[model samples]
Target: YHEWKMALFKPADVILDPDTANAILLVSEDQRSVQRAEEPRDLPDNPERFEWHYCVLGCENFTSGRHYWEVEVGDRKEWHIGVCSKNVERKKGWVKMTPENGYWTMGLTDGNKYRALTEPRTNLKLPEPPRKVGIFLDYETGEISFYNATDGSHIYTFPHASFSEPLYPVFRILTLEPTALTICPIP
Candidate 1:
């Protein structure tokens, strides 16, 4: 039953908003991909820029209904993926990258372990590392779910989420080496 649900949900078209990207983030031409910059470029100093973390937000915003998206993480050692409120903080220091801070995320550690960035932070156990990930958001139900897209294995769920405004897909990479996070589209 859930297998078809994963297959039927149309992946939302997402593109990185370079304006919201950090100084060390590089957005691809198609905007469907993002990677860490080997050398920081002289980008404009804007209030929306993330100064501390290598992160970016998707241009598409969702206020209601159910939407889904998939991301290809490849062999990246450390990465974060999930949704964030439009008003999420983009300032000069390391802000708490958690749901309470308007950023709901799940990430992979250096040891290939998975974790959900909640208050206490939930450790996720999967059969193996996920090469591809699926994010499902149901605004009406106030729920967000993650899955191993390659094997259709359930990962984690964030519930009782309350949103005051539109939310966008968020990404963060914490490796010095260039690591790419590609947004996959539905075929």
Candidate 2:
């Protein structure tokens, strides 16, 4: 579960509904569950793809488990939701989304494939049935961290994520948890 160029406050409170998922990459059973662009935009000409993406407008029922998914967005500017594990996820073990830009790769190992979200850029993809994952975001430092699925500790930091544009950008995630995972250890 991740947000792009947006701020996340207490993700544990958020939920993802697996019941709504189907045998797709980012689609829901209700169909209207996904947040999609009203129009079709040309996929970015960049090497990486980011178009035809979809966002789950309402993800308040995900616990740890399996899921079905699909995507639907304007094929422009390359876009797709990301699912991941490991608390320190910078790019590795992540998924890439961008089916409109003709063809593109997914995920990154270093800071060269993708740029910071603080500006116009692409996003990573999530592994199937992602569980116990943690996310980190810092626009000032230009880093978005992905943590371990269980016992959040190990992490991968996205070098950049945050941008300002007159665009209605909406990206979301589909997590599979075992029924509302706790955010922190009971100290």
Candidate 3:
């Protein structure tokens, strides 16, 4: 069972599971970074492999308790980082990432626009672009907050998340800008 620490937000070591990555995406062997590439790899058709989405999930699982992790987005302009239900549809219809669809994520799009992947999709205007993001998930309280990890500034928070199943950290890389999404080391 996952134990909670007295810290404000307990950190989780989110080692990404390569088995969940789409063929077009490459997960670093260190299991901490992922990137989208021009060519797809020949991978076995596993049940956990993403079919319609170019995304991947972390190895850890969480059903309750508070969890925290940070991701370095670097100079990328297109990316998605958040948590998703363990039973999320990976090999099915392409769906919008909404809480209704079991995804709690924030994304950065072209031209510096940002938004939360919620029902109706809320657009976000940040005080500054976040070079690194701190994703804080307080399961029992039904809250998911994103912070500017570099400066410890508040970015956005989802006040409600009725998590019905275990969750895993998810990552998405959509640009060809020679960048990689790396999960930061946490104690």
Candidate 4:
């Protein structure tokens, strides 16, 4: 299950606090019945300290021509996107994009690297940068899609969305869920 937490910024509405909000799974009030996702929560406040972040199982990030996601973890600095890479069956370690053909890509700033939950890149369509990206969840298909907001295109798809231990320090992970929904069986 993808980790869900409240965000520091709830522009559309105020639902949860940064540390408690879980955008992915809705934690109910009385903690009762659960339903499908509704609306996406806003971005979380920048992490005050450097940390590592990872994807959750069964979570996906698709792409088209833009790098997905953005963040401002610690450093008092905002990152558009530094880099995008992937680790497929035959490969080891995250491989960076080559602008040739890829299902996904990453972003980098200065010496730091980052990626969004969006679509991949190719010679014809390459992901640039986006302020916001779409995170999709499909229980029936067990697939998630990451799309660009500018043109509404997919970047990549992850069978699961978890995270790597090394990147946790630099990101404040947010589990995306729709509005007016709460996760049941609160832990």
Q: Give me the candidate number with maximum lDDT.
A: 3
Model with the higher lDDT, candidate 1 or 4: 1
Model 3: how far residue 33 lies from native, Å: 1.0
**Rank order by lDDT, top first?**
3, 1, 2, 4
User: What's the TM-score of every candidate structure?
Assistant: 0.92, 0.31, 0.94, 0.29
Q: What is the alpha-carbon lDDT of model 3 when measured against the actual structure?
A: 0.85
Ranking by TM-score: 3, 1, 2, 4
| Cα-based lDDT for every prediction | 0.85, 0.30, 0.85, 0.29
Clashes of each: 0, 59, 0, 76
- Please write out the lDDT profile of model 1 over residues 65-155, one tens digit for every residue: 8888899998888899999998877885878888888988998988577889998888888778888888999877788899888777888
In candidate 4, position 34 carries an lDDT of 23
Instruction: Residues 3-67, candidate 4: write the lDDT tens digits.
Output: 22113111111122223223333334443212223554454543321112221111222222211
Q: Residue 61 of model 2: what lDDT?
A: 25
Q: Which stretches of candidate 3 lie over 4 Å from their true place?
A: 1-6
User: Best-fitting candidate, measured by TM-score?
Assistant: 3
Q: Which tens-of-lDDT digit does each residue in 8-39 have in candidate 3?
A: 67789899898888888888989888988898
* Model 2, backbone clash pairs (residues 3+ apart or across chains), number: 59
Candidate 4: residue 7 lDDT (0-100): 36
Identify the superior model by TM-score, candidate 2 or candidate 3.
Answer: 3
Which stretches of candidate 4 lie above 4 Å from their native place? 1-16, 21-126, 160-187
